[PDB]
């Protein structure tokens, strides 16, 4: 089913068996990007491929803040993701203008999804070539993790995984007992699973950080990195 | 993978294996242009450009592939020059409609982020092609330090210690990997730039070439200036000499 | 002959990284007759290989040397309808200067603006780009003498002298010979009209007239046409140094 | 100089001796409101307000004459309260439509400058009156340090070490002149604030953090420290 | 201080001693209207209104000075009734153009804040007068608990444990100060309301009067309902009796 | 001529003897503000301001009656400060929406001309009052030399060698008439400024005062800077002494 004739050149075009091929292709732009995962506070990690030595450190970043209290973790076509981050930024801001406090992640996800989906109907554009996840903690709402794909679908999650191996990395998170564990524990078990899955970057948010989504300090990375390298040998 | 049928005539069109071919092609408009590079000393940033004397008849200070965007920001461009000049205008307005409101200079981080927004905007849609140019922005102030950014046709903003765009991307980047840029002063770097241009330049297939050069640092108050002719001719000479070898 | 697809829209990069529909627009300039412009030390001079396409014509129709302002002259090659429209754009642009800013427009900038504009037609599928190159030349005393050339792709180039059309190539190697930085404008008009006659194809093109342009300290800053004395005299000088 | 004929009914009307009376009157709407003050420690800024229990029936945390505008900015207001609350909304949006674009927090310098722009806008025109309120904005981060600003009805933004708006402006300012605010820590200051409220109050309290003390967050002052500082004021009063 | 000359004909006009008289006058439109009050039990909120039978000819459930704004929000109004009804509409839209987007119910805190924004908007300008009405909003859900707010003509939103607007503001508020509202259940309160209406009512100068009454609490799921006739007539009776 | 009836309440109203009184009144808003002056050396321009320490409690570098509008332009203001700050914003945008397009710095001639346009715009109409402030703009580059301009409420732009706005206009101007400003260097001038502030200042009726001071020249690259504290305190002292 390299279906396509015609059927796969526009988002404005259903295939006969009932499929918008140009979206599926947008999803395959996520597949060809490196793996990145997130798991419930909430923790994100990313298989960030040192494409060069010449880089800045803290360029590149595939873990954003959208707000103070929200983090974004992206996979696929990075230019697009950054623009979608901007959209989330505005959306969570034009909240606080009016409604006084922080935006609920449920809803912010719902909105930015609205937006992503908007690009799947029409012939004058292609859809976005990126998935991403949003993660937040406050105490009123608890811990929350969401994932949006190119087709514009917002999914709540206990943990998930996007990119090169989606598939491998998800079966590995199925193993863990995420509901129980503390955030401090998890960062290890993340970095494990990146290294497991990698074919031969890290993110807080929780009660652990006040509600602030921070980067993971270098102590804990290097230590958790090491723990991954070691439980690898096996 | 001359992929394309259909899949490579619009920016509105993903290939099946998940690729916007018309952007990649826009990137290959940068490749066919001459090399240009930029690189971050500890007290600032330096740009140089393999500027191919396409004629003798030219003005000097036409041609220029090193702009000021502001006083304190410099732009260094490669690929399709008409496009770049327009993108420069966009950066100009953006860094201006800053100072109107926000009072002082624009942060390079952000300006890059904005002009990137813009470049990316041309990658989604069928009624245009994307821009056929990469470029780099460099600034110094003392509060922010030295800063170097590179945007490509696909609209991605990258921070850098040094980078290189055009004919040899590839050769010129492996040569900057050698240098110890974090340490060195800007005054030193201008030499080591002009070396690498001359290293990488093709004597055979490209003809004669001039060389264009760019300051910004604590060395120049924060002002992005052109490099005075003393220092060019001297650094040019140093390149010619360490070439023979 | 790349093209399939790749060459029917300005909205379409070729795979090897090329907007073919612009290059084709440039080839509309090539098939037009030669025209050149060249910077003396006290000003700028334009000449045009204006092919008497008929005897029936008005004189001072046809004109491939415009005024855009008082102080700016335009010299065009390729698809003439387009050029005339671009002239209008330059006219407005240099005018909506003086409204506000009080004095004359700087050529640097005017060129930069009209270029902006030409380039605007190279990105999009609902139009083709302009099928014409042209040069702008001015003098004042504050700015000195200035010469610019814009091509279809929307690139503004400063120049000491340049040449657009049938032979670009021949006519440029001929201006390389001259010592333009030194010479006075009065001298140059000769050496122009020489080079038109040098380059002109006697065989394949038929008869031809010649059109000619001042601007310098020689003319106050005003871009004028070259008076008929100096044409017929410089025309003659070309005819003579031809025989050789 | 009850000047006015004509000269004092519009913001569109200069008096002959060169005065926009309708603004000065808007300032006198601040005077008739209760006192409120704010003052810059070395590690942050502190606000207090002579909040007159107009009733027992109230909510607690209604009424509030100390807002958050952002997380990191606090507002402290005096005069005509309906207006202030609307100006707070303006500040809110302004500091938000920052973070949308420019990525981080808004600089207080500038936010003040903006919201001032806005207040001044109401002073020129005949179809409106100007705002009947002064207010102060206070913030801390570490990059910018501690910062305190005051805008009045006429739309003027002033930086300050400490200031005071309302019933006694005048009394309360001469009292802050005494203190050594540049030196002191924020923890110390809250006392010396609440003192000065009680000094100035006519016999015949709400409180505000921001500093390194609170991460950069403008919080309300916890009840420990109020009741303790309140007590300290009551005591050094007797004298 | 019948101040006014000039100073009191526009909302665009500060008095010299620093006062927008035309708002204070709008507040005095509330005073000349009959009393109405609202008061926060621990499991919800209750409203009652001294509704003056201006005629026998009326519909019953015309007149109504207790609205629903939403399902879960109730409004209780005093002063100039035409205005109030329009402000209700504004609250209606505002709490609706919530649920469109944000999914669930509107928080009373905020809805009050918004509609206040709006009321205040009418206090600045010369081409209008402000609204001639106060009102109170009351809601319960379980997440937010019980909530009571009051907005006056000047556009100020106040949170409350209980309050009172109209003929006697003053009398009725001192009476609610007596009660222990934080403790009591909603079922208890409705009595103690209807008491205070009857206490405050002027037997001499006002004639006969009906009584209107309002639920919201855990008692009603979150729904603001009218108080069923059992409980009115029973609480009405209890008021009549503790009167004597 | 307290003329006014009618004639002096609107900018839309000529007096019968031919006068827009509401502008003249706007000018008298400048008079009641403290003095500030500016004066053109041969290598640049210098501003100083009789800045009345209205309190001890202030920030230092609040208050500022000397702005940067650009890097290369400085503004010095007198009268109604809220207005001035808004006019500064206008100048800021205007000199910015230059560099966007025209590539380099804005010419002071023109910037003044523009912002003036604007100030004048407020003198015709009944729905506004004009601005209650004068100000001066000063710049140096090498191409244009040193330049000093003053705009008053009526919207008139004036070039100057030196000028003075506020409490004593009059005193301070007769004092600058003394100096030989065309000759002198900027370094010299800052003294002679701060002299004239102190000369003119009223010791009786105004209390203490600070002093604010402003560079621009070849002395500072073209940058308008504040005057470093060395040179202030030293020039302040020189003023105090030649006072006695």
Author numbering:
A (entry chain C): 1 to 40, 44 to 203, 212 to 245
B (entry chain B): 1 to 245
C (entry chain A): 2 to 245
D (entry chain J): 1 to 204, 211 to 245
E (entry chain I), F (entry chain K): 1 to 244
Paper passage:
The proteasome, a huge protein complex responsible for ubiquitin-dependent proteolysis in eukaryotic cells, is composed of a 20S core particle, which serves as a proteolytic chamber, and one or two regulatory particles. The core particle consists of two α- and two β-rings, which form a cylindrical, four-layered αββα structure. The α-ring is composed of seven homologous but distinct subunits, α1–7, that are arranged into a hetero-heptameric structure in the order α1-α2-α3-α4-α5-α6-α7 with assistance of assembly chaperones. Among human proteasome α subunits, α7 exhibits a unique feature of in vitro self-assembly into a homo-tetradecamer with a double ring structure.
First, we determined the crystal structure of the human α7 tetradecamer at 3.75-Å resolution. The α7 tetradecamer exhibited an hourglass double-ring shape, which is consistent with the previously reported negative staining electron micrographs and small-angle neutron scattering (SANS) data. The conformations of the individual protomers and their quaternary arrangement in each ring of the human α7 tetradecamer are essentially identical with those observed in the homo-heptameric α-ring in archaeal proteasomes and the hetero-heptameric α-ring in mammalian proteasomes. The SV-AUC data showed that the α7 subunit exclusively exists as a single species with a sedimentation coefficient of 14.2 S, which is in excellent agreement with that estimated from the crystal structure (14.4 S), confirming the double-ring structure of this complex in solution. This confirms the homo-tetradecameric structure of this subunit (with a calculated mass of 28,284 Da, based on its amino acid sequence). Although a detailed comparison of the inter-subunit interaction modes was difficult because of the low resolution of the present crystal structure, the model clearly shows that α6 makes steric hindrances at the inter-subunit interface, thereby explaining why α6 is not able to form the homo-heptameric ring as α7 does. In summary, the present study demonstrates that the proteasome α6 subunit acts as a breaker of the α7 double-ring structure.
